């Protein structure tokens, strides 16, 4: 368990799931799909990547 | 009064019966152009549905017209006749003999 | 103000603390050369910065070409200060 | 109000109780290692949540990645509190 310290190292912070952020992202994806279809006159396909 | 591909993709995101009704209500040439751009399955389904079209209620027609009006975009001055191919040929004719040799080369290449 | 300028001429001392822990004197006597002692703070947490023994801010450890340095990150605003002193 | 903010700086202690039961001291003496003791509460009932020994709400048991958690469901509004204390 004992390790030497390096000032140029850092750790992670577990998991911070944000379901509300994902819902906001999906709603924004829908709105942006509509906007891009309106603008470019062609139907786009927007896929929300993993946060 | 719109481009075939744009209208095809627009009505492609609709129920096939609605697509068939719109195509029946559209111009024959425009509908034929739209149907040529559809996939085989959708095209066959539309052709089957058109062969068994029995009329639509006026309320449904009004709602469909309102939805189509809502789906409209900045279609004012849609498309524009500027040039292409012929203009490219004219430009090639104005470019040097060595340049037109390069032209034969690249055009054969594509 | 002018008195801020007056005290500016007065140098002060800054102290950086890696961490803190509590143990009995018997455990300290048990400790020998090469013994390992743990600290309450975890890895990557900002270190305390003390002026004359009073904590005023927190920072992160960096190395400057051969010398350790502290990269200030946050402050010890009264709510957080009271919360950490209550511990 | 401002005094709510003042007492906000004061930490408090929360207690979660699985259940309660009554028995004689002789029965407790009869109990040995590995003995089984029942509780008045049933399976799936919300557990009591106590602040300094005072029940204020109820919740359901959940596990957070390695740690138990309580999912608050209902309150102990005075009618229900009086009804359960009358028992």
From Swiss-Prot, chain A:
Subcellular locations according to the entry: Cell inner membrane; Bacterial flagellum basal body
Disulfide bond positions: none
Top-rank lineage group of the source organism: Bacteria
Function: FliM is one of three proteins (FliG, FliN, FliM) that forms the rotor-mounted switch complex (C ring), located at the base of the basal body. This complex interacts with the CheY and CheZ chemotaxis proteins, in addition to contacting components of the motor that determine the direction of flagellar rotation.
Entry's family note: Belongs to the FliM family.
Name recorded for this polypeptide: Flagellar motor switch protein FliM
This protein's encoding gene: fliM
From Swiss-Prot, chain B:
Record site: Part of the EHPQR-motif: 49
Motif (Part of the EHPQR-motif): 14-17
GO CC list: bacterial-type flagellum basal body; plasma membrane
Domain of life: Bacteria
Localization (cell): Cell inner membrane; Bacterial flagellum basal body
Disulfide bonds: none
Alphabetical keyword list: Bacterial flagellum, Cell inner membrane, Cell membrane, Chemotaxis, Flagellar rotation, Membrane
Main location: membrane
Gene Ontology terms for molecular function: cytoskeletal motor activity
Signal peptide: none
GO term, biological process aspect, one: chemotaxis
Similarity field: Belongs to the FliG family.
Protein function: FliG is one of three proteins (FliG, FliN, FliM) that forms the rotor-mounted switch complex (C ring), located at the base of the basal body. This complex interacts with the CheY and CheZ chemotaxis proteins, in addition to contacting components of the motor that determine the direction of flagellar rotation.
The protein's name: Flagellar motor switch protein FliG
Swiss-Prot record, chains C, D:
Source organism (scientific name): Salmonella typhimurium (strain LT2 / SGSC1412 / ATCC 700720)
GO CC list: bacterial-type flagellum basal body; plasma membrane
Subcellular location: Cell inner membrane; Bacterial flagellum basal body
Family: Belongs to the FliN/MopA/SpaO family.
Superkingdom per UniProt: Bacteria
Cell membrane as UniProt keyword: yes
GO MF annotations in UniProt: cytoskeletal motor activity
Described function: FliN is one of three proteins (FliG, FliN, FliM) that form the rotor-mounted switch complex (C ring), located at the base of the basal body. This complex interacts with the CheY and CheZ chemotaxis proteins, in addition to contacting components of the motor that determine the direction of flagellar rotation.
GO biological process, any: bacterial-type flagellum-dependent cell motility
Keyword list, A-Z: Bacterial flagellum, Cell inner membrane, Cell membrane, Chemotaxis, Flagellar rotation, Membrane
Name the record gives this protein: Flagellar motor switch protein FliN
Cell inner membrane listed as a keyword: yes
């Amino acid at each position: 368990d004992i390790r030497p310290y390096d000032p140029n190292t850092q750790r992670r912070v577990v998991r911070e799931r944000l379901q509300a952020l994902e819902i906001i992202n999906e709603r924004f994806a829908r709105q942006f799909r509509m906007g891009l279809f309106n603008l470019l006159r062609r139907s786009p396909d927007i896929t929300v990547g993993a946060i | 009064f719109m481009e075939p591909q744009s209208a095809a993709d627009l009505i492609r995101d609709e129920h096939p019966q609605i697509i068939a009704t719109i195509l029946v209500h559209l111009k024959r040439s425009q509908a034929a152009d739209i149907l040529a751009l559809f996939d085989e399955r959708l095209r066959h389904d539309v052709m089957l549905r058109i062969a068994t079209f029995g009329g639509v209620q006026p309320a449904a027609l009004a709602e469909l017209t309102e939805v189509l009006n809502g789906l409209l975009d900045g279609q004012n001055l849609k498309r524009s006749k500027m040039g292409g191919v012929r203009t490219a040929a004219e430009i090639i004719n104005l470019m040097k003999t060595q340049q037109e040799e390069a032209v034969i080369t690249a055009v054969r290449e594509f | 103000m002018q008195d801020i300028d007056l005290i500016m001429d007065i140098p002060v001392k800054l102290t950086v603390e890696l961490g803190r822990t509590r143990m009995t004197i018997k455990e300290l006597l048990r400790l020998t050369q090469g013994s390992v002692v743990a600290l309450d703070g975890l890895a990557g947490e900002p270190l305390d910065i003390l002026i004359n023994g009073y904590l005023i801010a927190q920072g992160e450890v960096v190395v400057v070409a051969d010398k350790y340095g502290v990269r200030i990150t946050d402050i010890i605003t009264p709510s957080e200060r009271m919360r950490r002193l209550s511990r």
